[PDB]
Amino acid sequence: EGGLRFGEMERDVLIGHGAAMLLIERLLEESDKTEVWVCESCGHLALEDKRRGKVYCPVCGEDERISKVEMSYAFKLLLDELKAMVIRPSLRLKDRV
């Protein structure tokens, strides 16, 4: 019961048509949409503790300045792979408006 692959060429025609929202709906909303906590101080991925009901960044701290950012789960896997490859990706957060 698998799905149909939306490959690189399909993304190319979607870009050529100028349909950004359709690309968002196809590649992100309908495939691997997820939400993660990002620390605003050092850019690391924050940790949410279901036991205490609190979100904090373990490497740096910052129990207050934590924001939720939605993105594809494949991007989170890529960030984890980069961290495993001794590469630090620092996510700089920006306001939507």
Partner 1 sequence: FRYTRFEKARIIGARALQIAMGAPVLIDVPEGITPLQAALLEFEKGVIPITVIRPS
Partner 2 sequence: MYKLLKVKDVVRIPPRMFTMDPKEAAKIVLRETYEGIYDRDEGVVLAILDVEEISEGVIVPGDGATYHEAIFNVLVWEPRNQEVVEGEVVEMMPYGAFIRIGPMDGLVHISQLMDDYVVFDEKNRQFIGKETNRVLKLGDYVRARIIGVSVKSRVIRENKINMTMRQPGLGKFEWIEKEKKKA
Partner 3 sequence: LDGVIRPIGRHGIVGEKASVLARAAFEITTQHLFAAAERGEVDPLNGVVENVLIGQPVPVGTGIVKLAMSLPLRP
The stretch near partner 2 (CB under 8 A) out of 7-15, 19-27, 37-45, 77-85 is: 19-27
Close Cβ partners of 14 (under 8 Å, ≥ 6 residues apart):
22, 23, 26
Judged by beta carbon distances under 5 to 8 A according to partner kind, the member of Zn ion, DNA, partner 3, none in contact with residue 28 is partner 3
The stretch near partner 3 (CB under 8 A) out of 39-47, 49-57, 59-67, 71-79 is: 71-79
What tokens does 72 get?
A: 């594809």
Footprint of Zn ion on 4-63 (CB under 5 A)? 39, 41-42, 44, 57, 60, 62
Burial category of 46 from C-beta neighbours within 10 Å (exposed 0-12, middle 13-18, buried 19 and up): buried
Per CB under 8 A, 4 contacts partner 3 = no
- The size of the chain, in residues, is 97
